[PDB]
Symmetry: D2
Subunit: 290 residues, 4 copies
């Protein structure tokens, strides 16, 4: 009863599998009684769809009841394209792309509207850095510009196209990382920069949609779920909280941002990171004793 989402429909761009935030969020959204549709990268839309209807994901659709997560559709979606005129020929001709169509952001919005009416909850859980391995001084223009297109501008496009089919009081959420605000070596070919752009756009768009649509626009900067393994232990050892960052922690937090408990919350960047954002110094440094 504190979060009754019955009545509400959500669309979640960026669920290819059951291990990302996208999946975790949907799980929670649905868990509060919302209809939940998914945007899925065409290249993997098939495998995901087979992976669902197989039975294979039932341990992961599993809810509080023992009932399973059901979806109001699972749409092809490529956040790199806003409308079909934008799609390059070789992609139209690409082997992993034929069969599936109407996968631009605009096309997907029209589809959601004709299939489910207006929506209440918008999630943006997609980021892509073709040069994330590379440091900024070794990042190309094409690289940088791609990282931003996929990660940053895709939120704006999404909001552009979903906004007009979003109920008053409705809300949207995206995902960021520390590196947006504070240097974090590793991350990665303009990914940091795109994230910064996302957080600014999160703010600007909270103003724009607040006014035109009455829609809340927020961001979660998350901890880490190789570069990673070390990052996981880093946070384990330097966070205010001696604990791992589970995906449910972020899902959990997104549920709130997208519930009417956050009806006055907009333009925010919520750190869901066991509190690492709050330190000005690692305690496990080689320069301190243990």
């Amino acid at each position: 009863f504190p979060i009754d989402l019955r009545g509400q429909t959500a669309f979640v761009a960026g669920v290819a599998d059951s291990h990302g935030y996208g999946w975790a969020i949907a799980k929670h959204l649905a868990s509060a009684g919302a209809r939940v549709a998914l945007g899925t990268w065409p290249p993997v839309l098939g495998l995901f769809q087979k992976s669902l209807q197989s039975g294979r994901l039932d341990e992961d659709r599993k809810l509080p009841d023992g009932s399973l997560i059901e979806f109001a559709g699972v749409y092809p979606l490529d956040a790199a394209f806003d409308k079909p005129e934008d799609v390059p020929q070789d992609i139209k001709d690409n082997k992993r792309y034929a069969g599936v169509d109407g996968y631009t952001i605009k096309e997907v919005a029209v589809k959601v509207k004709q299939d489910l009416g207006n929506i209440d909850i918008l999630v943006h859980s997609l980021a892509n850095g073709p040069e994330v391995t590379k440091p900024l001084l070794e990042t190309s223009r094409k690289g940088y510009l791609a990282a931003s297109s996929n990660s940053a501008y895709s939120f704006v496009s999404l909001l552009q196209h979903f906004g007009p089919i979003m109920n008053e009081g409705g809300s949207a959420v995206t995902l960021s990382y520390l590196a947006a605000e504070r240097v974090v070596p590793g991350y990665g070919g303009g990914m940091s920069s795109a994230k910064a752009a996302l957080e600014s756009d999160t703010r600007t768009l909270a103003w724009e949609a607040g006014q035109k649509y009455g829609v809340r626009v927020n961001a979660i900067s998350a901890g880490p779920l190789s570069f990673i393994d070390y990052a996981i232990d880093y946070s384990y050892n330097n966070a205010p909280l001696r604990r791992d960052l589970h995906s449910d922690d972020v899902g959990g937090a997104a549920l709130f941002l997208l519930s009417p408990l956050a009806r006055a919350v907009s333009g925010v960047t919520l750190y869901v990171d066991n509190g690492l954002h709050a330190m000005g110094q690692a305690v496990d440094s080689r320069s301190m004793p243990p």
Copy 2:
């Protein structure tokens, strides 16, 4: 859903039933918490009184329709830590007759005995005797007063309650935008008390995070003629979301922050303010056109 059953919450600074403290307790109870109240002793007898008669039965409504009940109402003056710290003219001060043991430490002992370990701790306390006076006209006495009532008290609440707090518990306080950015009129050092308060929220987060495994967060609220009046009007006219800020808004966002959903959330300042913090200018300005 989100389930505070089995859990006990201590809410410091609830005298009226129109403040944030009320709003917050109200919400915690709706989610199934045991709620205890700490009240500034001059208003206790009265407050306790007005509750018990049937006065507040309307303000205790429950959103099912039942009424919120309290596992206790406690005298609490947050200006004092030990009994030792109370000056005589207060011990003697007529306004305090009957009541005993309202120094943070004493409240803790009583709470520990009557109820045992708690999980949720709310700090709804702000007081500054020179608040109407601009900072260049605030005295040392009032500025320390303000810091002593609205910052330190939080530190002491933790110092004394931390010990009785279950691992995974969380505390919250309430801040205001002036602590990061100039709000003319919010004077007396309240501005400064609050920047200290947000800072302690981060420091304590680390410390309590590490020592008791507890989370520490802040809600930076908007405004709930007058100086308030103009404030409300401004925010209504300039915030991304064109609405009034109800106390339920804060109520709900505390309810998220103090709940398991927020277990990876620590050391944050959460703006519950209709988006206003996100703004770099007023659309309202007599410099702009309508």
Copy 3:
């Protein structure tokens, strides 16, 4: 005093003589620097021309009374990194006739040869073809355009100049408040380009700091009818210091940031804005009284 003698500064993006680039070069020269200029090639012939005739002799005055001289004026289009990246219709585009080698890398080689290692690098470059359009009406094309002109270019400037930069050198770029907080009207993704830009300033600071031993900082400037007009008026009416923002103000603060006085200063955003960033509200509001 502070002494840039023996030192050489490269200032990218000086076409007019009323921008920040002019103001900055002007200041560096006053402190005894060799100053070279990079100019967007369509305006070079002209700019170079107007200099040489005696036109700008008044805007080159020197505060002793002598005139600023340039160790070079260079074609520089910051949209291109290698010659390879130039499209034909540009190579052919009539507006570019005569000039060759204005891709960041080429400019660097020429600068390295003609002058050798530099110590000071200025990035006065911002361009967004959809800036008048709100973010919900900005396209992917223009948004990437904006990022490509006003963010990445900085990254490339460093990538290519870093190599020829003396240890202890410093670079600066220019940001704007909208990158942290919503300024309605500053659209086209310029807002986003700038948040990326401030972010790169921190990342690069680390990297260039470590690799070339160079510092990287930003000046977030105020405004130097119109949308500007209202902006200027607003800031004049709402900033702590009731003054107009001269370009010398920015000029001087770059001059500090690029000088030995600032050798422990890296990765900052410096607001040179009459204090306006510090504000949480307008005293101007039609919600307030006079």
Copy 4:
């Protein structure tokens, strides 16, 4: 000529010896041709005065020319007291306090005005935490409240009393530390919190003095010049800059904030810390390899 301070008088509260920032700043201020008066803790005013006239400090008064720093007076000053009615009897009777008088902030302002006329530059270089060894959960009220009184409120008092004798265009500066904004274990009995308050007051006071006096109010958050030794190596190994933080680095930076090159700079917090503020992660962590 870029910083000609000839004509200008400065007062610098907090110079007991030649190793603090207070001394470094004066050195630079004087170095730009300013008259510089010093506030000195009465308890040490004698030893400092003897230490000067002895010859002993001549290597440290040493300027660019070979000439020495001269002062327009060296005043007893205790930033814990604003006016004499504030001073406790035992202090008046204290052994290290007799002889010297008129040492409250108000009294010192009157003295400066009657001796030197109006002033142009105000420096606030004093901080005191009687419990800085202790973590926040072990800090007493008296401790906390003292740390703030000495460190935070002393700036406000200073500005209150100097403001009215400060020329239009004049400016003031104070010193802070990371821990204000980000947790730094070690620091220290409410010192962190006071610093947060200082930075807020730095902002508020830039608004107040901007309007009433036309005076710029800024802060330098500095790096570190035991708890320390480790902190020095910490920054050495984790900063964007592989270098030590000399006192001249801060002095340098204060000179700018207090020169007319910063005529548009107010409410700022300038990181002068080899860039440490900019990282979100230590590179020498035990969790990374080296």
